């Protein structure tokens, strides 16, 4: 009887609650007759205790049909992406405006006629880039969840206070469930697919951005139990960021753990005169650039422009600072070595800036492809080490500029001395050059 | 079982295991933890796995457990912990992190007094045991143990010990300057406490014939008293958090704007001007305050204050521009 | 080159519709849309005689 008759008799609207009273009465006589007919022993059974719980049996329904509808669209293995325009953001269906009784103090303001104001346009400027949402690709599930939450919040405003409070805390529960379901269910696909990590990061930064202004948009329309400041969503903002960051860097360390491995065949960049040591060195360098090319293609038009460029610069910094350390730790560099080391460095500069592709159109790529040193911090030392590889001793002395030139700011004096000793043989000219360098 | 036997029974088993783990930790039983596994992290992961694939009837209890296991994990992360390896938080601020400081430094962070773990975990896990009682009996549809059917007589109620447990941890978090955590633990606990009384007792026509009138009056009084406490506490939390946000070098404007919405309507700007009166030691702080004030005035649809905030922002920008050189903008700043 | 304006016309009109295709064909972003048997995309109103 409970699982087939009393479950479906529970109303879905608070207006129909009173009509349930007869069901409470009609059950009791059904309880009494079986007591007079000796079909029961006691007085209180589970058939009557379930009927008296109609209060909770109401809430535990209204607070689950909005939760199950969320988790239904959260465990789907089908992935979709939608682009977010900074100007156009989803708005609530028309906000509940207050009554006209508060318009007595409003019509006295909308009666002034001014013409000296429209004739003057202040030139004051603002840095509005710090309060918008940059272009990104968010999963359609997150957008549908946000629209469901907006609909639930709108519906809570046109009902009794019990339903409003239950729906508001069910909306809070929706994000609480989101914070724990997606990372656990997609555990396999957040390690092997670089695109999904960026998609998850974008979803978190979208939800965190919306949660900041979600509370204020319904501050004066809910019940007075929630109109003073307790109803808010700021507390969850710090957590979601940490959810969107740690997941992304887990992809970074996985990628770095490849590049260095692809450099394991570099053989410490020694004995370049050997043909095998040249071939095995070219093998590592081709694959290092190829990995970054494919990764940038995968991340193209997914991450925002700033973070994509910063992550690419960060990966390239680790790619270049290992080769720089290998070169600066060498001992013998002959004339043949000074040519092949420059040849290996040539490919990196030829196809380095060519990896950056923050947008889809080819014309927009070259604008960002020329600001590589702004993002990559160790670009200048590698440029200097390039042109030192075939520079003469007197040219090195000139470019040192007595500790004031680009080479002085690039490396350290002892490093330059060691590199010169590895480059030039034991001559009095080398001693004079070392005396020039302090 | 979670890898090979994904179904409702596995979810129920995982929920029961996670329930028993919290009870065992609450009873101060020393259990040998293998080295390399975080205990609160493993509790939270088990709760999440139970919540993902559980039946719709167990979904609410699993979600309630997940809401609090994450809070326990966050409390543990602020404490120096062992038996998993090295989990000392001060090891993070001692040196600069290459990978992290372009996706972390853009957001506000708070570093206060290090929390001692002996006073945190036993209280919070006992709270978890109290909030989610051990349930093994048959569950009829539309029933739970976190939004239950219970009477509130003179002194009868499960919320009463929970209030004292929250109060014990709240004062501890106050003196440790853990305001960022305190706001979340206040809001999450207040929501559950409000629901525990709301879920039954505002359908007056139906409630009187099932529980009487005096119980309704008692619930009405208790809700008002708890709300009056919470309103006063939230304002004091938010003011200090707002004070601490702006003192940083790279001020997080996005989070400061969110923190500004907690205060009442008319007293935000009144505070902000006071904040600009403790200002003019650094123009960058003035610009950061002016941007937030302009954004909040626009959000509040207050056109009049927006012009003043924009003029102040322009004055701060000109002051910074002149401070780059040797020109001083002091004598005329914030005048006509 | 000027006397070839015939072909230079066609080789334009026959490429702007091809490049626009290959542009949307080499994208690495994947999306899926469900197809309902009853509702199929129709041409904008057909040219009647």
From Swiss-Prot, chain B:
Purpose of the protein: Essential component of the mitotic checkpoint, which prevents cells from prematurely exiting mitosis. Required for the assembly of the dynein-dynactin and MAD1-MAD2 complexes onto kinetochores. Its function related to the spindle assembly machinery is proposed to depend on its association in the mitotic RZZ complex.
Task: Report the subcellular localization.
Answer: Cytoplasm; Nucleus; Chromosome, Centromere, Kinetochore; Cytoplasm, Cytoskeleton, Spindle
Q: Which organism is it from?
A: Homo sapiens (Human)
Name of the gene this protein is made from:
KNTC1
Q: What is this protein called?
A: Kinetochore-associated protein 1
Q: In which tissues is it expressed?
A: High expression in testis.
Recorded superkingdom = Eukaryota
Assembly description: Interacts with ZW10; the interaction is required for stable association with the kinetochore. Component of the RZZ complex composed of KNTC1/ROD, ZW10 and ZWILCH; in the complex interacts directly with ZWILCH.
From Swiss-Prot, chain C:
The free-text tissue note of the record is: Widely expressed.
Q: Where in the cell is it found?
A: Cytoplasm; Endoplasmic reticulum membrane; Chromosome, Centromere, Kinetochore; Cytoplasm, Cytoskeleton, Spindle
Query: What's this chain's function?
Result: Essential component of the mitotic checkpoint, which prevents cells from prematurely exiting mitosis. Required for the assembly of the dynein-dynactin and MAD1-MAD2 complexes onto kinetochores. Its function related to the spindle assembly machinery is proposed to depend on its association in the mitotic RZZ complex. Involved in regulation of membrane traffic between the Golgi and the endoplasmic reticulum (ER); the function is proposed to depend on its association in the interphase NRZ complex which is believed to play a role in SNARE assembly at the ER.
Q: How does it assemble?
A: Interacts with NBAS and KNTC1/ROD; the interactions are mutually exclusive and indicative for its association in two different vesicle tethering complexes. Component of the RZZ complex composed of KNTC1/ROD, ZW10 and ZWILCH. Component of the NRZ complex composed of NBAS, ZW10 and RINT1/TIP20L; NRZ associates with SNAREs STX18, USE1L, BNIP1/SEC20L and SEC22B (the assembly has been described as syntaxin 18 complex). Interacts directly with RINT1/TIP20L bound to BNIP1/SEC20L. Interacts with C19orf25 and ZWINT. Interacts with ZFYVE1.
Extra remark beyond the main annotation: Overexpression as well as silencing of ZW10 disrupts the morphology of the ER-Golgi intermediate compartment as well as the Golgi apparatus and slows down ER-Golgi transport.
UniProt lists the family membership as follows:
Belongs to the ZW10 family.
Question: By what name is this protein known?
Answer: Centromere/kinetochore protein zw10 homolog
Native source species: Homo sapiens (Human)
